[PDB]
Each structure stands twice: as C-alpha cells, then as structure tokens.
Amino acid sequence: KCPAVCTCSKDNALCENARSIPRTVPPDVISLSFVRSGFTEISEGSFLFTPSLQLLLFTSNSFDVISDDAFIGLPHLEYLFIENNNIKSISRHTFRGLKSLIHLSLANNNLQTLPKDIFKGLDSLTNVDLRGNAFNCDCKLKWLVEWLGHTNATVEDIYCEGPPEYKKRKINSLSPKDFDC
Ligand SMILES: *[C@@H]1O[C@H](CO)[C@@H](O)[C@H](O)[C@H]1NC(C)=O
C-alpha cells in the first residue's frame, strides 16, 4: 500500500523524485516529506485524499508556482515546512484552509516577495520562519511590516537584501513611517 515513489517508515512516508503527489498514501501516515520531487507545481486540492497529515515537508524541490488552495483538505496539519526550494511564485491563498497550522517555515527558499494576506486565516500559528530569503524592500511587501507588528506568532529577524542602499535592514525594526508609497 506504500506508494511506489515513496518509502514508508513506522508512521511516516518519504518520497524522493516523485513525478506526482500520491493520493493513495496510507491513512496511518501522519507526516509526509517530498525531496527532489519531479513535479514542478502544487495545484489546488492535491492533498484532499490525505487528510490525516499533521506535518508536511518540501525540501530540495524546484517549483514554478504553489497555487491557491493547494493545501485545502488538511484540517489536522499543524506543521508545514517548505525549505531549501526554488519557488518562483507563491499565491495569496496558498495556505488558505489550514486553521490548525502551528509551525510554518518558508525559510531558505530565496524568495523575493510574499503576497498580501498570505498568513491571513492561520489562527493556530505560533511560529513563522521567513529567514534565509532574498526579500527586497518595496511597497507591496509593506503589509508584511504591519503583519509583523500585530502578529502573535514568533518570527525571527529577517532583512531585505535590496535596495543596495538599504541592504541588510531589519524588516522587524521597519515601521510604516519609513517607506513612502
Ligand atoms: C493570540 O490570538 C488568540 C486569538 O486568535 C488570542 O486568544 C491570544 O490571546 C493571542 N495571544 C497573545 C495576545 O499573546
């Protein structure tokens, strides 16, 4: 029953070089990991048939887009780790539908931006790891500083690489009074 592209441990399954997201994952598996996967995108409703997942991991993947509602149908997901990936586009409602999500890590994806209200609706969120990215200080990321002021969750210090004059400036220290838009 363990998917061909995956190897299953005691309560966990790990998939390497998977050409597609398997929908036949055993129900007893509560966390899933995708490493160097073949598929280039996460379309909406991909995890609908694996509702038992409490933790999800994506590492060493190259993703064109992670679209809206990709993680819909994951009510029990408390942990989502997307790290060490090449992600060209992340969508506003990507994480919509995860109200049990506790720890979310987008660290080390070399992302240059995040869409507004990407963390809206994540109520159980106690920690967010945005470190290790290529964020550029702009007006469109403006919302982020506001979200960093009014957020419960613990978010470690992150910095914008550009513009070159404002390189390595503390995103957490940044305030609405600093950027003119
Ligand atoms: C975090 O938010 C919840 C409601 O979503 C609230 O009950 C709780 O007091 C907040 N934690 C704080 C303010 O430390």
Swiss-Prot record:
LRR repeats mapped onto the chain: 52-73, 76-97, 100-121
Modified how: Glycosylated.
Tissue-specific expression: Expressed in the brain (at protein level). Expressed in cerebellar cortex basket cell terminals (at protein level). Highly expressed in the dentate gyrus and CA3 field of the hippocampus.
Domain LRRNT: 1-32
Intracellular or extracellular location(s): Secreted; Synapse; Cytoplasm
Residues carrying a glycan: N152
The protein's assembly and partners: Oligomer. Interacts with KCNA1 within a complex containing KCNA1, KCNA4 and KCNAB1. Part of a complex containing ADAM22, DLG4/PSD95 and CACNG2 (stargazin). Can bind to ADAM11 and ADAM23.
Role: Regulates voltage-gated potassium channels assembled from KCNA1, KCNA4 and KCNAB1. It slows down channel inactivation by precluding channel closure mediated by the KCNAB1 subunit. Ligand for ADAM22 that positively regulates synaptic transmission mediated by AMPA-type glutamate receptors. Plays a role in suppressing the production of MMP1/3 through the phosphatidylinositol 3-kinase/ERK pathway.
Protein name: Leucine-rich glioma-inactivated protein 1
